[PDB]
Amino acid sequence: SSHKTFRIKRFLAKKQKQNRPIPQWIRMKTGNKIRYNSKRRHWRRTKLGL
Amino acid sequence: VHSRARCRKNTLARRKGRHMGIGKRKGTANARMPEKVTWMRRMRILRRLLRRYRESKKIDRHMYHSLYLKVKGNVFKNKRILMEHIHKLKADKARKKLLADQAEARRSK
Amino acid sequence: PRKIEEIKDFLLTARRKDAKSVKIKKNKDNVKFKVRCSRYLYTLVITDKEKAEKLKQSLPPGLAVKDLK
Amino acid sequence: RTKKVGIVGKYGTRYGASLRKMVKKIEISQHAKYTCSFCGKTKMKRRAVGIWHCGSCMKTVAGGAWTYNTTSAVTVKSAIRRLKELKDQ
RNA sequence: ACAGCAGUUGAACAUGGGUCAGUCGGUCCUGAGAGAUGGGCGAGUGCCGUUCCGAAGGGACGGGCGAUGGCCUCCGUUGCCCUCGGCCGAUCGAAAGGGAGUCGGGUUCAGAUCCCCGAAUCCGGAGUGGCGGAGAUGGGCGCCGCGAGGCGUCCAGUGCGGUAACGCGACCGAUCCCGGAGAAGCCGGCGGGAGCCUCGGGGAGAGUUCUCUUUUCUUUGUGAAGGGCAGGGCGCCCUGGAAUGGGUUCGCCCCGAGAGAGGGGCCCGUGCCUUGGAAAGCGUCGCGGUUCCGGCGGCGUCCGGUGAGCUCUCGCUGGCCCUUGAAAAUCCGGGGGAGAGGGUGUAAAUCUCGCGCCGGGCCGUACCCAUAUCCGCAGCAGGUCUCCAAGGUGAACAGCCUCUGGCAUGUUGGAACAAUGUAGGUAAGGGAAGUCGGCAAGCCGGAUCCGUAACUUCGGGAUAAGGAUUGGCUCUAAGGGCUGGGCGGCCGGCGCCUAGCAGCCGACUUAGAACUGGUGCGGACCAGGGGAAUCCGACUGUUUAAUUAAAACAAAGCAUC
RNA sequence: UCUGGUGGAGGUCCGUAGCGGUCCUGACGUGCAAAUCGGUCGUCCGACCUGGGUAUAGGGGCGAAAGACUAAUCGAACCA
Ligand SMILES: [Zn+2]
């Protein structure tokens, strides 16, 4: 809701910032094994632990 | 456009009495026109008339009070009936003084 | 907003060190002299044009004057 | 309007005839206005059970549940006056 | 890739961006309750307990006794001692309870009572007085001054008015004490105010004009905070003394404990005018620059009437209760008079009066709020708390049609119209012969006028049962409000409103009649079939969420322990 | 005593919103749905309906009582 605490807002801020795709240059790093961000979270599909 | 021309034409006819018969009534007589509002309006008319008659000294306090309780007792249907009854009382009171003065004149003669 | 009904009171309000500006407005029927102070906007309504021009001349110096034309 | 039901016509047929008859006596006394012994005006109504108020002199009196004065109260008041007078004289 | 067809689309994917407050909430207070310490219990983590087995105050008028700093004659800060002093105990507990104070106009791609413009407001601080005003500036004795007006002395002065209710711009005062406000249910009925709807005109724009319609549609403002005036209310006051009782409400109700009558007082004032205010907003007609100028300009934003109308709100007055419908923070008033001030200055202490100066930190704020942003594994016919609520018909927030606003038929389309099905209808003559059973469907249905049985706990049964009417059109009768009563007035006998007369204004109904249609008319919509009995339970209520709503449970009453 | 008014009582009646869930033993029954849909129904000022906050926890609670309910789990839940 609009009414939220500071602790909850800071928790939602962090999940928002970590929902980004992998950068393109990571694939070029020597000995790289990551192809995509397997921890992508969609708001409608998966809900937060909160 | 949402014209009110049709409803205004029907309201004019309805004010004349049209579309208001037995076949056009769905609510009861009390739902359409409450008996309490009819009674309360009637008392306000008749009590107002009695107050004006008292103020202008057409009737006195003792005639006002008896007529007030008869109005509360549903004796007079409307203002016209109450006006005629007051006039009959005024004639009777005048007559009682007419034969009183006649009797006093005869006795003193 | 406060309404002042005396010219003498208006001059006192205008000469306050708090006063910031005098705004003159001309209407169809009256002329309104408005002095803006810290707390209230003081308005004087004058229905005579002869007295209106006199008030402009007697306005205190230095105080900003704006004509709402 | 009614032959015998009186004030308990509000209950219709919903309880026994004898129960409606018993409550008829109590409901008349619990809603009646009595004459105030302090100011003389007939305005002594019931606020709650055992509480009686006068709307003119604003006096509140502890009384009966449904009647202003219980018979037990009158006898006790008369008896206490006798016991007090015997102590004095 | 996903959105079960597509997709130039998306609540998908990618890149950027977006939430601004003293006056909107949180924050503060307590509620039901939760919970430490003291104490007790407990092998023990710990538990019980919330005033109960505690030396539970750390504060403060004021006074004294000392240090210290200053616009240092003096005052202020800091320690110690008297005086006062119940926390009737920490603390937590509400984004719907309590709780000071903000509202118009504009502005964005997305913010906004938060930004800009404008106009206000509350709280706190101001010591070294911020400026005014108040307190507060009189009287007596003389002298001089022609006299006014000044010189000396003495004595007052913590305001004033009204018979009163109370009023005026302030109008000292501590510990202590009393009170108020915060702070009270549900239902009914009336009345006031506003918003909306309605009606009659006047503007501006638009629609229709085949014929008519001087028409039909849209639009036709003034925030908070001050000031004044209506209006509403009053168990507020003064005169006075009432039965031939009177006053008065829709209902009531009121009076020698003071009616009616007259004259005042107070509270609320969300209404009107006014400052704010037209400069802004809107409507319409034009003229510019250029993407935006809150561009510029002209005209307008008018006058009325209605009402058991609906909604909100403010009042008054009742009904019900073996039901009586929070608490605390916080704020205020009063009682008392411990104190302080100055000796007549142009003065003091003091001031809840007017204006002036400074500040108001932290957190929330975007959007969905649901037949697609929430839960049900999903864009799931399920579930999920509220606010505003137009016209017509009509008892209605019923159903049916429409306007403002919204939408694209609910995860696809094309063609055809077979059986069986799901949903909706109709049917000759019979009229339950079907079937366990009238299951299902059908009949009745509104309103008005008549007329209503057995039985009964006398309340009911009851819309019992049964019958008639119902359209359209044209009339008639009845049902009300205001004003007046012998150029402008008025000193006057000269007038007499008196079966209530004249003029003006107005809305909603009721009853009766004529005419009239292929007897059709509660024409759609809405909308009880009924009667005679038996069994059970008295009734209202409740129950196995997801097969049993019942005769089961409860219940008032009765009785027992 | 009778009559005509006024008045507005009630765990009162018809009946919206709301709450519930009779019958069709209708639809659906690899459903829209691990209980939904339609018509028809009960109640609708009260023992009424409902949000939030609080309290009661497993041989325990709560129960106008059906062994009902206690997170799709109840003649003793769920987790290890
Ligand atoms: Zn009394």
User: Binding site for Zn(2+): which residues of D?
Assistant: 36, 39, 54, 57
Neighbours of B37 (CB within 10 A): 10
Report how far apart, in Å, the C-alpha atoms of A16 and of each of A23, A42, B5 are. 16, 10, 60
For A50, half-sphere exposure in the C-beta direction (CA atoms, 13 angstrom radius) is 12
**Using CA atoms, how far apart are residues B36 and B43, in angstroms rounded to an integer?**
11
DSSP string, A31-50: T----S-TT---TTTS----
Cα–Cα distance for residue pair C17/C14, rounded to 1 Å: 8
d(CA C1, CA C36): 9
The experimental resolution of this structure, in angstroms, equals 2.5
DSSP D34-67: BPPTTT--S-EEEEETTEEEETTT--EEE--SSS
Q: Which residue type, as a one-letter code, is found at position D20?
A: R
Nucleotides of strand E under 7 angstroms from a protein beta carbon: 11-15, 25, 95, 118-121, 189-191, 198-200, 215-218, 224-226, 235, 244-252, 254-257, 274-279, 308, 319-324, 355-357, 363-369, 373-375, 378-379, 391-396, 402-403, 446-449, 457-460, 469-481, 498-500, 508-512, 521-523, 526, 538-539, 556-557
**Strand F within 7 A of D47 CB:** no
Residue A26: helix, strand or coil by DSSP?
helix
Q: Which amino acid, residue B67? A: L
Method of elucidation: cryo-EM
Question: Smallest Cα–C1' distance to nucleotide E475: which residue has it?
Answer: B16
Looking at the DSSP assignment, which residues form a beta bridge with residue D54?
A: D44
Residues C53, C66: Cα–Cα separation, whole Å: 15
